[PDB]
Structure formats: C-alpha cells, structure tokens
Motif scaffolding. Structure first.
Motif, PDB file in Angstrom:
ATOM      1  N   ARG A  64       0.828  -1.194   0.000  1.00 31.27           N
ATOM      2  CA  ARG A  64       0.000   0.000   0.000  1.00 31.27           C
ATOM      3  C   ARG A  64       0.869   1.253   0.000  1.00 31.27           C
ATOM      4  O   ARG A  64       0.769   2.123  -0.863  1.00 31.27           O
ATOM      5  N   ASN A  65       1.601   1.445   1.094  1.00 28.69           N
ATOM      6  CA  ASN A  65       2.305   2.662   1.424  1.00 28.69           C
ATOM      7  C   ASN A  65       3.489   2.837   0.469  1.00 28.69           C
ATOM      8  O   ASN A  65       3.380   3.769  -0.318  1.00 28.69           O
ATOM      9  N   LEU A  66       4.443   1.906   0.468  1.00 22.24           N
ATOM     10  CA  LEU A  66       5.692   2.016  -0.260  1.00 22.24           C
ATOM     11  C   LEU A  66       5.573   1.632  -1.728  1.00 22.24           C
ATOM     12  O   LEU A  66       6.280   2.195  -2.558  1.00 22.24           O
ATOM     13  N   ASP A  67       4.506   0.899  -2.050  1.00 26.20           N
ATOM     14  CA  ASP A  67       4.115   0.454  -3.372  1.00 26.20           C
ATOM     15  C   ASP A  67       5.351  -0.081  -4.060  1.00 26.20           C
ATOM     16  O   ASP A  67       5.806   0.512  -5.040  1.00 26.20           O
ATOM     17  N   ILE A  68       5.861  -1.230  -3.613  1.00 26.66           N
ATOM     18  CA  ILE A  68       6.944  -1.940  -4.255  1.00 26.66           C
ATOM     19  C   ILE A  68       6.471  -3.367  -4.478  1.00 26.66           C
ATOM     20  O   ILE A  68       5.776  -3.884  -3.605  1.00 26.66           O
ATOM     21  N   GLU A  69       6.617  -4.013  -5.642  1.00 27.31           N
ATOM     22  CA  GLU A  69       5.766  -5.123  -5.998  1.00 27.31           C
ATOM     23  C   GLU A  69       6.124  -6.426  -5.298  1.00 27.31           C
ATOM     24  O   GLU A  69       5.303  -7.339  -5.235  1.00 27.31           O
ATOM     25  N   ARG A  70       7.358  -6.606  -4.808  1.00 28.67           N
ATOM     26  CA  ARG A  70       7.882  -7.916  -4.486  1.00 28.67           C
ATOM     27  C   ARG A  70       8.804  -7.721  -3.291  1.00 28.67           C
ATOM     28  O   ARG A  70      10.025  -7.723  -3.457  1.00 28.67           O
ATOM     29  N   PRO A  71       8.263  -7.473  -2.101  1.00 26.34           N
ATOM     30  CA  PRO A  71       9.193  -7.213  -1.015  1.00 26.34           C
ATOM     31  C   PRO A  71       9.885  -8.445  -0.453  1.00 26.34           C
ATOM     32  O   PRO A  71       9.216  -9.406  -0.101  1.00 26.34           O
ATOM     33  N   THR A  72      11.219  -8.405  -0.557  1.00 29.30           N
ATOM     34  CA  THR A  72      12.203  -9.194   0.149  1.00 29.30           C
ATOM     35  C   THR A  72      12.478  -8.867   1.611  1.00 29.30           C
ATOM     36  O   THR A  72      12.176  -7.739   1.990  1.00 29.30           O
ATOM     37  N   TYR A  73      13.065  -9.718   2.454  1.00 29.67           N
ATOM     38  CA  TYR A  73      13.444  -9.403   3.812  1.00 29.67           C
ATOM     39  C   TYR A  73      14.365  -8.197   3.799  1.00 29.67           C
ATOM     40  O   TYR A  73      14.310  -7.492   4.805  1.00 29.67           O
ATOM     41  N   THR A  74      15.152  -7.920   2.762  1.00 29.14           N
ATOM     42  CA  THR A  74      15.907  -6.700   2.595  1.00 29.14           C
ATOM     43  C   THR A  74      15.104  -5.418   2.396  1.00 29.14           C
ATOM     44  O   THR A  74      15.365  -4.538   3.212  1.00 29.14           O
ATOM     45  N   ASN A  75      14.051  -5.389   1.572  1.00 33.30           N
ATOM     46  CA  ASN A  75      13.260  -4.178   1.428  1.00 33.30           C
ATOM     47  C   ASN A  75      12.590  -3.898   2.770  1.00 33.30           C
ATOM     48  O   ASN A  75      12.252  -2.742   3.000  1.00 33.30           O
ATOM     49  N   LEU A  76      12.448  -4.932   3.607  1.00 27.14           N
ATOM     50  CA  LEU A  76      11.832  -5.016   4.920  1.00 27.14           C
ATOM     51  C   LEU A  76      12.771  -4.596   6.044  1.00 27.14           C
ATOM     52  O   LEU A  76      12.475  -3.603   6.721  1.00 27.14           O
ATOM     53  N   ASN A  77      14.031  -5.024   6.090  1.00 25.07           N
ATOM     54  CA  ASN A  77      15.108  -4.579   6.950  1.00 25.07           C
ATOM     55  C   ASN A  77      15.572  -3.159   6.691  1.00 25.07           C
ATOM     56  O   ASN A  77      15.895  -2.445   7.645  1.00 25.07           O
ATOM     57  N   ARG A  78      15.583  -2.619   5.466  1.00 26.81           N
ATOM     58  CA  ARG A  78      15.948  -1.227   5.256  1.00 26.81           C
ATOM     59  C   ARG A  78      14.758  -0.399   5.716  1.00 26.81           C
ATOM     60  O   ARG A  78      14.921   0.780   6.032  1.00 26.81           O
ATOM     61  N   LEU A  79      13.568  -0.974   5.831  1.00 28.78           N
ATOM     62  CA  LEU A  79      12.431  -0.334   6.473  1.00 28.78           C
ATOM     63  C   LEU A  79      12.663  -0.341   7.974  1.00 28.78           C
ATOM     64  O   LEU A  79      12.569   0.697   8.622  1.00 28.78           O
ATOM     65  N   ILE A  80      13.138  -1.432   8.593  1.00 29.01           N
ATOM     66  CA  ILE A  80      13.257  -1.404  10.036  1.00 29.01           C
ATOM     67  C   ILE A  80      14.305  -0.411  10.509  1.00 29.01           C
ATOM     68  O   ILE A  80      14.153   0.364  11.457  1.00 29.01           O
ATOM     69  N   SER A  81      15.380  -0.284   9.733  1.00 26.37           N
ATOM     70  CA  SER A  81      16.487   0.617   9.991  1.00 26.37           C
ATOM     71  C   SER A  81      16.088   2.088  10.052  1.00 26.37           C
ATOM     72  O   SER A  81      16.797   2.782  10.785  1.00 26.37           O
ATOM     73  N   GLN A  82      14.959   2.501   9.463  1.00 27.47           N
ATOM     74  CA  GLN A  82      14.443   3.800   9.818  1.00 27.47           C
ATOM     75  C   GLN A  82      13.852   3.945  11.212  1.00 27.47           C
ATOM     76  O   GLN A  82      14.109   4.952  11.861  1.00 27.47           O
ATOM     77  N   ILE A  83      13.389   2.870  11.856  1.00 32.82           N
ATOM     78  CA  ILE A  83      12.843   2.763  13.202  1.00 32.82           C
ATOM     79  C   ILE A  83      14.021   2.847  14.167  1.00 32.82           C
ATOM     80  O   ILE A  83      14.085   3.801  14.930  1.00 32.82           O
ATOM     81  N   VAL A  84      15.101   2.068  14.095  1.00 35.89           N
ATOM     82  CA  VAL A  84      16.313   2.103  14.892  1.00 35.89           C
ATOM     83  C   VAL A  84      17.038   3.441  14.821  1.00 35.89           C
ATOM     84  O   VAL A  84      17.364   3.985  15.871  1.00 35.89           O
ATOM     85  N   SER A  85      17.204   4.080  13.657  1.00 36.59           N
ATOM     86  CA  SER A  85      17.877   5.353  13.554  1.00 36.59           C
ATOM     87  C   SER A  85      17.048   6.500  14.100  1.00 36.59           C
ATOM     88  O   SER A  85      17.566   7.488  14.628  1.00 36.59           O
ATOM     89  N   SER A  86      15.719   6.412  14.145  1.00 31.56           N
ATOM     90  CA  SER A  86      14.920   7.302  14.963  1.00 31.56           C
ATOM     91  C   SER A  86      15.090   7.064  16.451  1.00 31.56           C
ATOM     92  O   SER A  86      15.296   7.961  17.275  1.00 31.56           O
ATOM     93  N   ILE A  87      15.123   5.801  16.887  1.00 31.90           N
ATOM     94  CA  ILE A  87      14.997   5.430  18.279  1.00 31.90           C
ATOM     95  C   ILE A  87      16.185   5.925  19.094  1.00 31.90           C
ATOM     96  O   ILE A  87      16.027   6.270  20.256  1.00 31.90           O
ATOM     97  N   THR A  88      17.366   5.974  18.462  1.00 34.68           N
ATOM     98  CA  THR A  88      18.680   6.310  18.975  1.00 34.68           C
ATOM     99  C   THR A  88      19.105   7.737  18.677  1.00 34.68           C
ATOM    100  O   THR A  88      20.269   8.042  18.946  1.00 34.68           O
ATOM    101  N   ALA A  89      18.312   8.566  17.995  1.00 36.17           N
ATOM    102  CA  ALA A  89      18.790   9.839  17.472  1.00 36.17           C
ATOM    103  C   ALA A  89      19.276  10.820  18.529  1.00 36.17           C
ATOM    104  O   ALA A  89      20.270  11.511  18.322  1.00 36.17           O
ATOM    105  N   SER A  90      18.639  10.943  19.695  1.00 33.15           N
ATOM    106  CA  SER A  90      19.078  11.832  20.756  1.00 33.15           C
ATOM    107  C   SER A  90      20.385  11.406  21.409  1.00 33.15           C
ATOM    108  O   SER A  90      21.099  12.169  22.070  1.00 33.15           O
ATOM    109  N   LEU A  91      20.852  10.173  21.210  1.00 29.49           N
ATOM    110  CA  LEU A  91      22.124   9.619  21.623  1.00 29.49           C
ATOM    111  C   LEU A  91      23.221   9.913  20.603  1.00 29.49           C
ATOM    112  O   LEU A  91      24.282   9.328  20.768  1.00 29.49           O
ATOM    113  N   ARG A  92      22.944  10.535  19.458  1.00 25.86           N
ATOM    114  CA  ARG A  92      23.851  10.487  18.321  1.00 25.86           C
ATOM    115  C   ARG A  92      23.885  11.844  17.635  1.00 25.86           C
ATOM    116  O   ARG A  92      24.755  12.122  16.807  1.00 25.86           O
TER     117      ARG A  92
END
Lengths: 150, 48
Positions: A64-92
């Motif tokens: 729906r959102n990202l509209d990419i036809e065939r998501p791999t665990y990689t298109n999925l992990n580069r998605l999670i990495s936006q969650i981790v880099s937000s979570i830690t931002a005040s430390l960095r």
C-alpha cells in the motif's frame, strides 16, 4: 537465556529489545506459539520493555504505502532501519528535545508486565507520492496513528 | 492298485486358527492446571 545473565551481571542497567513478534495468519515455523510464550515468561522477568514489529504488517506497508511489488526481507530490513535510527537519534545527534533509553521505560511502562509496546514509522512512500504529498507534521502524525499503517 | 486315499504333506496347518486380530490405541491426554492466577497491574488496597 541471555536476558537473565545480563540481569545477574549489570543489575539496574537498561534492557530494551527489538522483536519480530509472530504473524496473525502467516507462519515461518510450526512451533512459533510455543517459542514465543516460552521467551515471554522470561521477558516478563528480565526485559525493562520490549519494542514489537510484525513481518505481516510491513509487507502490507510494502504493498500500500511504499508500493513496491515484491518485497524481500531486505526491502523489509531497510524499512526497520528507519525505526532504529529514529529510536537512537538523541544519543547520536543534537536536538530540541532529548529522548533516552531510560525515558522510553518511564513513559511507556505503567507496570513492569504491561511493557510490550508496538512501533510504527512514517512516512514510508516512494517519490511517486512524495511529489504529491505536502508532508507537514500533522499529516505525518495522522500517518502513524492510522490502523492500516501499524 | 487302491492307494488308500493318501493325505497331503506338509501344509498351512499352523495357520488354521489365525486371522490375526488387532490391538488398540486411545490418546487422549490430561488437562494441565492453570488455577494459580492473579493479576498485578491494578490496586486492591489504595482504591479504598
């Protein structure tokens, strides 16, 4: 096993975790309900809080959102990495309002057993929409509360 | 020339009662006990 030996050895130090939490209709393995419950009976004893994500959801963010036809665990992990880099931002990175690893605990956790929050991130779209959306703060806030984006 | 109606040798004579029958299985299990329960995430005294 590890959640305990970190208790025994660092005491009062923070334990947070990032968890893939199992899927409503999909399964990767048969015995997933045993393994989750087994861990959870220890997670209630040792983790200070746990941040949950579902693989079944980010697939649908991919459709729906990202509209990419065939998501791999990689298109999925580069998605999670936006969650981790937000979570830690005040430390960095400097900021107007700090949020620390301790400050998640004291604001998300009303009892040391009601300590499983869910994560979301937004916006999560391609340029096919990001040149049509305005992307003000309030749109982006609406876009994390939205049940189809969780 | 009468042979006296000679009998066979030697047959499935050990099978004459044999079928054989089948054994049984019944599994079937016992319930675990989950009666040691109480919640902690509220108030029982400071509510008063």
């Amino acid at each position: 096993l590890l959640m305990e030996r970190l208790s025994v050895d660092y005491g009062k130090k923070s334990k947070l975790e990032f968890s893939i939490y199992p899927a409503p209709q999909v399964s990767t393995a048969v015995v997933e309900p045993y393994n989750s419950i087994l861990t959870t009976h220890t997670t209630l004893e040792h983790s200070d809080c746990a941040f949950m994500v579902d693989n079944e959801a980010i697939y649908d963010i991919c459709r729906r959102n990202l509209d990419i036809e065939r998501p791999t665990y990689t298109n999925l992990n580069r998605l999670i990495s936006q969650i981790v880099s937000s979570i830690t931002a005040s430390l960095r990175f400097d900021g107007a309002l700090n949020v620390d690893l301790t400050e998640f605990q004291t604001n998300l956790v009303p009892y040391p057993r009601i300590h499983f929050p869910l994560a979301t991130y937004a916006p999560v779209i391609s340029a096919e929409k990001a040149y049509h959306e305005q992307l003000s703060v309030a749109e982006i806030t609406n876009a994390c509360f939205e049940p189809a984006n969780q | 020339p009468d042979l006296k109606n000679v009998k066979s040798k030697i047959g499935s004579t050990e099978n004459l009662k044999h079928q054989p029958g089948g054994g049984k299985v019944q599994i079937i299990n016992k319930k675990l006990d989950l009666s040691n329960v109480q919640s902690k995430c509220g108030s029982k005294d400071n509510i008063k």
